[PDB]
From a paper:
The phosphorolytic exoribonuclease polynucleotide phosphorylase (PNPase; EC 2.7.7.8) is encoded in the genomes of bacteria and eukaryotes, and in those domains of life the ribonuclease plays multifaceted roles in regulation and environmental response. While the C-terminal RNase PH-like domain catalyses phosphorolytic attack of RNA, the N-terminal domain has lost this capacity; instead, it contributes to the ring-like quaternary structure of the trimeric PNPase assembly. Two recurrent structural motifs that are found in many RNA-binding proteins, the S1 and K-homology (KH) domains, are appended at the C-terminus of PNPase. The PNPase studied here is from the bacterium Caulobacter crescentus, which has been established as a model system to investigate cell cycle progression, because populations can be readily prepared that are synchronized in the cell cycle.
Crystals of the RNA-bound material were obtained in space group P22121 that contain a PNPase trimer in the asymmetric unit. The other two KH domains were found in the unbiased maps. It was also clear from the early electron density maps that RNA was present and interacting with the KH domains. The refined crystal structure revealed 12 RNA nucleotides, and while it was anticipated that 20–30 oligonucleotides would be present in the structure based on spectroscopic absorbance, the RNA may have been partially degraded during crystallization or may be extensively disordered in some places. The S1 domains are therefore apparently disordered in the RNA-bound structure. The three KH domains (residues 556–619) interact with the RNA in the manner of three overlapping hands grasping a length of rope. The RNA follows a spiralling trajectory, with bases on the outside and phosphate backbone innermost. The path of the RNA continues from the KH ensemble to the aperture of the central channel, where a base stacks on the aromatic side chain of the conserved FF loop. The KH domains adopt non-equivalent orientations with respect to the RNase PH-like core, and each domain contacts the RNA at different points. However, the structure suggests that the 3′–5′ polarity of the substrate originates from the interactions of the GSGG loops with the RNA sugar–phosphate backbone by the KH domains.
Author numbering:
A (entry chain B), B (entry chain C): -1 to 619
C (entry chain A): -1 to 620
The structure:
Amino acid sequence: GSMFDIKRKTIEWGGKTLVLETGRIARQADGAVLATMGETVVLATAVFAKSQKPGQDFFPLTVNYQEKTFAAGKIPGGFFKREGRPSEKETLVSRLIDRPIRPLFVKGFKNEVQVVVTVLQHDLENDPDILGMVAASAALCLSGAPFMGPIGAARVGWVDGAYVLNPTLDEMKESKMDLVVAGTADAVMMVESEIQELSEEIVLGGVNFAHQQMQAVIDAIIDLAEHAAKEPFAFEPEDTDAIKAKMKDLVGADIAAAYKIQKKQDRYEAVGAAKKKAIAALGLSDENPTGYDPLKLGAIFKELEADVVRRGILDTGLRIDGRDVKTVRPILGEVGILPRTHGSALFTRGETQAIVVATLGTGDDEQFIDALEGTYKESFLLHYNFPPYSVGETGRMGSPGRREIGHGKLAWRALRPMLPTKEDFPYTIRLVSEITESNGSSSMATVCGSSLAMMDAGVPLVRPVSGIAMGLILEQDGFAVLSDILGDEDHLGDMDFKVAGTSEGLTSLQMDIKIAGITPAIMEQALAQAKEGRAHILGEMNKAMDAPRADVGDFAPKIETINIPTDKIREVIGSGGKVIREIVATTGAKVDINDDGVVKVSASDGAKIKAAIDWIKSITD
Amino acid sequence: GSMFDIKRKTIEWGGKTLVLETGRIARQADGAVLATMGETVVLATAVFAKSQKPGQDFFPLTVNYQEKTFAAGKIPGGFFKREGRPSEKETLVSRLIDRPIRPLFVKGFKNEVQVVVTVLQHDLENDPDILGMVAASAALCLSGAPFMGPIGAARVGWVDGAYVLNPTLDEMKESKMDLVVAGTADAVMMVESEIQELSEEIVLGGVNFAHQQMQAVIDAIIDLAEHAAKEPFAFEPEDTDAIKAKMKDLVGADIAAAYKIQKKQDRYEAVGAAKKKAIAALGLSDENPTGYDPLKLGAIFKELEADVVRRGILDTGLRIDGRDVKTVRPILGEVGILPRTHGSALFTRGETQAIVVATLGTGDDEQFIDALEGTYKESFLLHYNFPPYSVGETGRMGSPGRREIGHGKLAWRALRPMLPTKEDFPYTIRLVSEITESNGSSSMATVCGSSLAMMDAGVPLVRPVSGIAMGLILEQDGFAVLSDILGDEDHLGDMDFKVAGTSEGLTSLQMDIKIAGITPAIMEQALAQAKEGRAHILGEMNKAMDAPRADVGDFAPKIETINIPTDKIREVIGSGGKVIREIVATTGAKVDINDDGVVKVSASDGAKIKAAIDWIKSITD
Amino acid sequence: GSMFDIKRKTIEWGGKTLVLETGRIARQADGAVLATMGETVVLATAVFAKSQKPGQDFFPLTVNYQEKTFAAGKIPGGFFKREGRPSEKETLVSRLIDRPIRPLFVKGFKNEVQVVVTVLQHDLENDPDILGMVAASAALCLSGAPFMGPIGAARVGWVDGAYVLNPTLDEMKESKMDLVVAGTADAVMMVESEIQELSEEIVLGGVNFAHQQMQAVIDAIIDLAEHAAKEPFAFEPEDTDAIKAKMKDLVGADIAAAYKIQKKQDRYEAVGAAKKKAIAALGLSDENPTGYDPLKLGAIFKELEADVVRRGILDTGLRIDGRDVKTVRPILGEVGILPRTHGSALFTRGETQAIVVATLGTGDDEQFIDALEGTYKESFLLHYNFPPYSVGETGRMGSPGRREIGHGKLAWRALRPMLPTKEDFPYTIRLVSEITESNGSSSMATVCGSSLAMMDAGVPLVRPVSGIAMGLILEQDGFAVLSDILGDEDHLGDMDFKVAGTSEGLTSLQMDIKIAGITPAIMEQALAQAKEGRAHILGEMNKAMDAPRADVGDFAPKIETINIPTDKIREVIGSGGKVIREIVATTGAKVDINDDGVVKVSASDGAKIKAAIDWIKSITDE
RNA sequence: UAACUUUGG
C-alpha cells in the first residue's frame, strides 16, 4: 500500500505470459522494470547523468547483463562460491543489448547512461536473454532519457519448415536456426544468428517474422510508459545543418580532392590538416571572429568527412582504394603453415590477415560451462585474438575484451553447424585465430582461415565455410551496397552486416543497422551481392585446400569410436575391472565405455587403437 | 648493519607477553614495529607523503593487512603456490584497522598514508588481528605523522558468565561473544561484534571492559614513542572557525530559516541561495583579494550546513524528512517473491530496499577457507551487492569492494547465531543480498531480508533477527539519539551504530565514533532506543512471516539418509558405476554412498528419493 | 593478396637451420619477422609511434613474449581453456628481450615502441627463447626505428668440458651451465645464467664463446635488413655536450655537496639546487626565452649528476658514502628470528635488508608448471616481495610485477645448484623473501638470507651461497670496479652485474651492460674483485650460521619413504580411494604414491609415519 | 559387481 505500481501483466506473447512491473523495486533508478516471462524473471534498470562531463566527445553508454546462480537454485561452482567476472554468456548478452539501443539516443546526447540487467529466476525453458533485451528497453523508456521509441526483440527458430517464436530451450533442440533479432516499430536494428545451411529467403523471412512478432511487446512497453514513465529529460538536438553547410563551403574539395595518398594511411596526415584548418577560422574564442564551440566542431567535422565520402561512392561508383562496390580484394589461402600443429592456415584478403590453428583434443580438454540452465560440456572452442600490431598500433596486451569475445563467437556460430557429429569424429576442437593484419572483417578472415585450418587438421567438415563483410550506403535518392568493406568504410554505412555460410546455404548472418528504412527489398539484394562475394571467396579459398585431409596430423592423438551391446559391458569391464584394465595396460589405449555401449578408444598410434578394438570385439562378437 | 632498537618487551597484557620493537627492521619506513604477542609475530609499517597531490580533495589512507602462509609453516594451496589477492580475513582486518585510525588524523591532512601489516608467524592461539591493530597504531605514532594519540584494541569474549580478554582461538570455542573494540585513551572509536543473544547490559559491559583493558597497551605505545618516535611532521591547519564566523553571520539566518520550510526536496531557494550567495560575498573575486578557493569555502559551507541541521534537530526535535528522533520509516516485508528460488524476500524500509535470496546446498557447496590457523569448511555464505542504481548513480559493476565485504560480513555476524545445528538442518546456506535502493543501513535491511528469506526457504532458524542503524548528535548542552537514520544523517552524527538481534538479545553490535565524550550513560540510552526500534521492525517484519516454513521448497533438494552393508557397496555402484548411475538417471535422484555405508539420497521430488531408495534396497536385500 | 618476401633461409647456426622471413605476415607492423630455428617457429613484430606523447619523460619500450599452447599441439588446462595471465617463462623471457635492446635506442628517443613475440610452434627441442630474442632483434632493425642493433643471442652449455652452442632441451639435461647471452657486434650487453659451481675462468670463457658464435646471426640480420628494411625513421640525437658544459659551471658545485650529504634520503639538496636552480640559469620561459627545454634539461641534469658522482670516484677512490671501491657495507645475518617457521633469517647489508623464510612441504605443495615442452612439477619455490615501504615509499600492494618475478628467479638460479638431491631430502622447499629495506641488491640480500634460512630449516645444502652486486665506471683513461653498489650507484655504472656462488665456483652471474669498451681483461678483474666480495660476505654470513642444522624444525614435517610393487598401487589406493583415505584419516599421515611405486609418507610424528608405513606394508607383502 | 583417491588457473 506504500509504493505505487503500475504493472502491464498483459500480453500473452507467442502464447507465453509476459509481465512488465514498475514502481515496487529500485525506485531510485531513473527507470526500473521487473519483467517476467512465465516463471523466468529479470530486473532491468536505467540510470542517466543529468549533465555532461566537461569535454565528453562520445556517448558513454554501458550495459551490464548479469546472472545470479540463485536464479536456478544453485550456488556458484568457483573456489569462492561467489559470482565474479562476466561469463561468455554475460559478455555476449550485454553486447546483444548494447548494439540496438546505442544508436537510438537522440543526436548529440553524450551523458552517462547505464543499464543493469540482473537475471533473478530461470525456469529452465524461456531464456532470460530475450526477456533481458525487452526489460532493458522498457526500463530505458520509462526513465525519461532521450531514447527513441522502445525496441522489441525475439528469437526465431525453424522447426517443421515453419518459423517458431521464442522457442523454448527444449524446442531449440529441434530447430535448424537460432536467430535473435532486435529493432523498433519502424526499423529492424540488430541481427545475430546461427543457421543450419538455410536459404537467404528462409533467413530473411525469419528476420521479418521477428519484426512483426515483437510489435506486440513494443506496444506493451508504450502502454506502460504512458501510465508510469517519468517526465522526459529536456534535451532536444541541435540543427547542425546550419554550421555544417558553412564547413562544406571551405573544406568540401579540401577533403574530397585528396584523402588519399593513400599510404602510409596518411591519409591521416592530410586528414588532420583539413580538420585543424576548419577548427581555427571556423568559429571559437576571443572572439573576434566568433564563435561556435571549439569542441563541438570536431564532431561536425567527422560527420562532414563521412558525408563527403558517401557521395563520392554514390556518384561513380569507386571507393577510397581504387575499387568497385562489387570488388572483393585479392585473396590467398595457405594451409599447413605450421606443419607440427594439428592444422594450420594463413588466410589473407587485402590488408586483413589471420593465422588460424586447429588443435584436436580428447574429453579431458573439453570445456565446463556452468550455465544457469544446467551445466554443459563444450567440445568446440574458438578463440579470437586482436593484437594492436595488426593495425600498426601499440597497445595493452592480455585477456580478451568484449569485442574479441564477440568476434570469436561470430566465427564460432559460422563454423559450428558444419562440424561432424561426435560419432563420426570424437575429438574436441580448439581453433585459435590470430589477427595479424586488419582492414575490414578480421572475423570473416577468422571463419575462412578456420575452414582451412580444420581441413588441414583432417576434420571431416560436412562442407567448407566462407565469410564476407558488407556495407550499405543509403541516401534518399538511391543506395549502394559495398562488398568486403575496409576499416574506413565501417562507419559510413547506415548498415553493416557480416555473412558466412557454405556453398549451399547460410550459417551465420549478423546485422547492425544505424537508421530506418532499410526495406526488405534492399536487404534481399544486399544478401544476394554477399552471396556472390562469399561464393567468390570460397572459390579462392579452396584452391588452397577444397576437401578435408584423409587423416589427422602425425602429432594429433587418435580417437576412434565403436559400439557394443549394452548387456555385454559387464564382460568387457570384467570383475572390477579385471579385463578392461588388462586391455588398457597391455594395448596402451584409453578405453571409455559409457554407457549405451558407446566405447571410444584413444592413443597415439592408429595401431594401439586397433589392438584395443580387436581385443574388445573378440569378447563381444 | 649495526642496529639501534629500542624495544618495549613489556606488559603482561591479558596474561600474554606483548613485545613492541623498533629500529631493527624496515628502518626506511617512517615507522616500523615488530609486534609479538607471545609467539604470534607481525610487522607493521607506516609511511606518509611529505606533501599533498595537487587537487587532492579527500584523505588518502590505505591499510594493507596481509597474511603470509609461511607464518603457519604452510605453502599456499593455489595452483600458483604464492599468496595472491586478499582473502575475506585480509579484507576485513584491513577495514578493522582502517576504521579507528582514519578519523584521528589532524584536520585538513590529506597526504598519502599507507599502513602495511604483515603476519609473519602464527602460534595457533593468539590471533594476529588484534596484535595487528596494535602494531599498526604503534608504527603510526612513531612515524611522526600527524596522528592523534595512540589507539589500542582488544577482543572480549564471554565464557562462564565472565569477560575474557583476548581469548585465544581455543578459548573462543567456548565463548558466547566475539567482540572487538578499538579506541584512544579518551574514547571508544570502533566496535564490531558477533553475539550469542546477549543483553545490551552484557555487551556494553564488554565494551567498557575492553576500553579499560587496552590502556595498558596505549601506555606501552606512548612509552616506546618517547624513546624512538620521530620529529613530528610539521603540519597544522588552518583555523576554519574564523572564516566560518564571517560566513556564519552572512548566510546563518539564511540556511537556518531556509530549512523549515519544508518540502521542495531539501528546501531550495534560500538553500542554494545561501550557497552561491556566501560564495559571492567571499572567495577570491578579486575584485578583492581574500580569500577562499571555493573548494576550501565549499568545505566550510558543508560544515556550516551540518551545524544548522544538527541545531535544528536538538531544538525540536524534527529531522530533515520531518520525522521524530524515535520514528522508524514505514516498512514492508514480502516473502516468496521469486517462488522457484529456494527462499526469497523483499525487504523495504523507507528508501532502503534489499532483494534477498536463500539457496540450499550440500557438501560440495561449502566454501574452503584456508585460515592460517587451520583450513576449515564454511557452510553459511552471505554475499552483499551494492549496485550503483540503488542510489540513482552509475558506476563500475563487478567484483565486490571492501565495503560490500564488510556489510555482507556484518549481516553475516547478525544472522549466524540463530542458525540451526547441522543435525537439524544438514544444508549449506548461501544468502545473496542485492541492495536495490539505499538511504540508510542497507546492511540492516540485509539482515531483515535474510531472516525472512531463510524462513521462506524453510530453515528452522531458532528465532528471527532484525536490525536498525542509529545515529547520535552531541552538543555541549544536550544530545539527540536518532533511529533508522537517513544517508544524509550519517555525516552529521558524532556516532553511528548498527544493532541487530532477536526478541531475546543482541546478535551483532557495530559502532563507529568520531569524537570523545560519548558516555557509558548515553550509550546505555542509545542502545535502549535501538532496542525499541529493532523490536518495532521485527513486529513489522514478521507480519509478513513470523515462523519458518515446515518444509524446504519444491526446488530445494530434499535429503534423506539410509544405511547399507559395506560388503554390498560394490553391488550398488556396479561395474564401472553402471548400476548407480542407472538408478540416478532413471529415478532422477542423486545418490551419495561414502563409505562405512552411509547412503544419502537427494532430489527435488520426494517421489524421486523414494523411487531411488526402493531401488537401492532391492539390491541390498 | 600477393606478397613480396624476402627470406634469409640461411645460416646453419650451431648446426640448426635458422630462417628469417618478412613480407608475408603482419605487413602493417613497422617490422615483422617469422623466425624458424628448425621446426620451432616464432613471430616477432616491432611497432613504433611516429611522434611523442605530450611531455613524455622516459623512453616507453614494451616487450610481450607469449606462448600459445597450440604451438605444442595442446589445449590450455585452465577452467577457461584459454591462455591468460603470463606465465613465469613468459614474464622472464620478456625481460630477457627487453634488457639488451632498451639501451640501444638512439639518445633522446622517447616514442612508444612495442615488441610482440608470439611462439607459434615448438619442436620440443630448440627453445623458443633464444629464437625469440633473435626474431625481436630482426623485427626491430627492419622497422627502421632508431635502434642501434642488430643484437644476437645464444645459450651456452657446458657438457663434457666443452662449450656447447644453443643446447637442445635434451642436451641441457647433461649440461653443467645454462648461460644465456645477448649483445651487438661490438659489445656483450646482457648475461643471465644458472651455473653448477663453475670457475670464473670457465664462465667468462662461455661469455666470449657466445659473443663470437652469435656474430653469424647478427650478420644474417644485417643482410636481411639491407634487402628488406624500411627507410630509417628520421630522428637525429642532440649534441648535449653543448648545453651540458654551461650547467657544470652552475650546479656542478651544488650537486657535489648534496651527495657529500646523506641520507635525506632525500635529497632536498639535489631537489632544489639542480632543478629550478640550473633551470633558472638555462631554460625556456617567460621570462627569458632562448633556450633549453625544462624537460630535456632534466635528462641533461641526471647525466651531469652521474658525471659528477662518477668523476668523484675516479678522483679519490671514495664513493658517496665515504667508502673504498673494494669495501663491502657492514653486514649482519641472524637465524631463527621466527623460531616456529621452518627456517628463518634476517639479512642486513648496509641499508638493504631481507626477511627470509623457508617452508618445507610434501608432494601436494609442489607447483604444476605446464611448459609447452611438457608439464612438470617444481619443488623449489622462491618468491621475492619488494614492498614500497622498503624504500620509504607508498604504493599499490599485490601480485608480483616483472622485476619481482625476475629477482626471485635470479636468487632462485643462485641457490638451486646447491640444493640436496631428492634422495637425501625429499621435501618441497618454498623460500619467501621479504625485502624490508633497500639500497642496492636486495636480490643478493635475498640469496644470502635464503642460504641462512634453509640452513636454519635443516636443509643439507651441499655448500652455502652468497651474492654481491657490482658496478663499473669506465672513462676515457681509466676504470673503477665497485663492490656492493649503492642504489645511487646503479644508475651511473656502464655495467651492472650480480655474482653469486659458493667457495668453489659460480652459481649465477647476471650482467647488464650499457656501452662497448669492456675488454675481457676488465671482466676478468671485475669478477675477481667480486670473488673477494662474495667470499667476504659469505665469511660474515656463516658467523650467523656456518652449517645446516642437524634436523628439520620441530614444526616439521617429517618424510620417510618406501618402495612398493607397481601392480599393488591399486590395493593401497583401494576402490575409489576407500583404503588410502582411511589410512590418511586414521594414521594422520599424508600418503604420496608416485608411479614407480615409490611411496613417500609424511607427518609431524615419526609415530604417524610408521603407522602409515606398517599399514601399507601389510597390504603389500607376500 | 567400485578401473587407481584426491579436478584452486
